[PDB]
Amino acid sequence: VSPYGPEARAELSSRLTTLRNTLAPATNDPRYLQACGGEKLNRFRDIQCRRQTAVRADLNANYIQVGNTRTIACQYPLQSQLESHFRMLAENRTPVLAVLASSSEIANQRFGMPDYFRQSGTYGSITVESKMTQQVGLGDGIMADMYTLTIREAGQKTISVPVVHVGNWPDQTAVSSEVTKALASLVDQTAETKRNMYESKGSSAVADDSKLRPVIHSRAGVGRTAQLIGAMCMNDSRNSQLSVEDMVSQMRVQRNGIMVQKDEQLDVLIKLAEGQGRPLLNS
Ligand SMILES: [Cl-]
């Protein structure tokens, strides 16, 4: 009986479907961060932000810990949220910002996805400089474009953030397991280089577990984002024996029930787990 056979797969899907359904947000749900005074918080009305793990009161963004792996998952910031988003990125000493929304999505003005990392700009008191750096192919034609974002604000320490932009991963799809591995390695390596610099400089952030977290977002911050975070957690040696059930349940209780949004995205996590001999189900 394979632990990765149709019966185990069906059981995993049944457990996760129950969890998605019971985590769906109620109106004024105490579990979810609420908008204040009419200003839009959630890019998508029913893709909400777990209050207990919210990063900032005015962002749809969550602290995520899968096993031992600590990240932030968020939605693509709204235009009104850009100053706060850049403050999140700077205060976190962000070692990598992985953006998985496509160039086509960002270009479509109907979607309200500001092009905040590929060009320079001013957002309230913050000035952001963008520089293009290397381009890395990930397989199957999927491409990572990298940037450095330098975040300035009078009186504040200047912070530069490495960005990994996958510009051609379409919404509601899963890139293959091989592409996912290549992406997770690139994001982890980018993060480790930048974290190492901070540690070399004696940054206080090194000792603060709310900081130095990779920040990942897509458009909603639940589909492409969750596939990448699940693959990153499987690269962390500390996460031996953490099951797929655990990793998806943790992302869901810590952000919302949509984390791992499409069956094809769950299937990639299952395939990566099987490759490691990692359990799918608890017990
Ligand atoms: Cl909560």
CB 196 within 8 A of CB 51: no
CA of residue 187 to ligand 1 center, whole Å: 28
CB 280 within 8 A of CB 7: no
Specify the number of domains making up the chain: 1
Experimental method: X-ray
Distance CA 54, CA 31 (A): 11
Nearest to 169 by CA among 118, 109, 104, 263: 104
CA of residue 49 to ligand 1 center, whole Å: 8
Which stretch of DSSP H or E encloses residue 65? Answer: strand 61-66
Distance CA 150, CA 160 (A): 4
Burial of 89 (0-12, 13-18, 19+ CB in 10 A): buried
Using the CB atoms, write b or e for 73-83: b if 16+ within 10 Å: bbbbbbeebbb
CA of residue 251 to ligand 1 center, whole Å: 13
Nearest to 96 by CA among 165, 3, 15, 27: 165
Strands (DSSP E) contained in 154-242 are 159-166, 215-217
CA of residue 59 to ligand 1 center, whole Å: 14
Distance CA 217, CA 74 (A): 5
Distance of CA 50 to CAs 59, 105, 181, 249, 272, Å? Answer: 11, 25, 28, 13, 27
CA of residue 213 to ligand 1 center, whole Å: 20
Residues 6+ apart with CB under 8 A from 157: 90
Residues with CB under 5 A from ligand 1 (ion): 31, 50-52
Resolution in angstroms, to 1 decimal, for this deposition?
Answer: 1.4
CA of residue 235 to ligand 1 center, whole Å: 28
CA of residue 17 to ligand 1 center, whole Å: 19
Cα dihedral 130, 132, 135, 140, rounded to 10, equals 50
CA of residue 70 to ligand 1 center, whole Å: 18
Nearest to 226 by CA among 62, 79, 34: 62
DSSP assignments along 94-133, one per residue: -S-EEE-S-HHHHH-GGG-----SSS-EEETTEEEEEEEE
Helices then strands, each counted (H, E), the chain: 7, 8
Tokens of 115: 């092009």
Structural Rg of the chain based on CA atoms:
18
CB atoms within 10 A of CB 254: 17
What phi and psi, each to the nearest 5 degrees, are found at residue 95? -85, -20
CATH number, domain of 123, equals: 3.90.190.10
Distance CA 273, CA 260 (A): 15
Distance CA 39, CA 19 (A): 29
The residue segments making up the domain with residue 74 are 1-283
Breaks (C-N over 2.5 A) in the chain follow: none
Distance of CA 101 to CAs 47, 155, 161, 175, Å? Answer: 16, 32, 18, 13
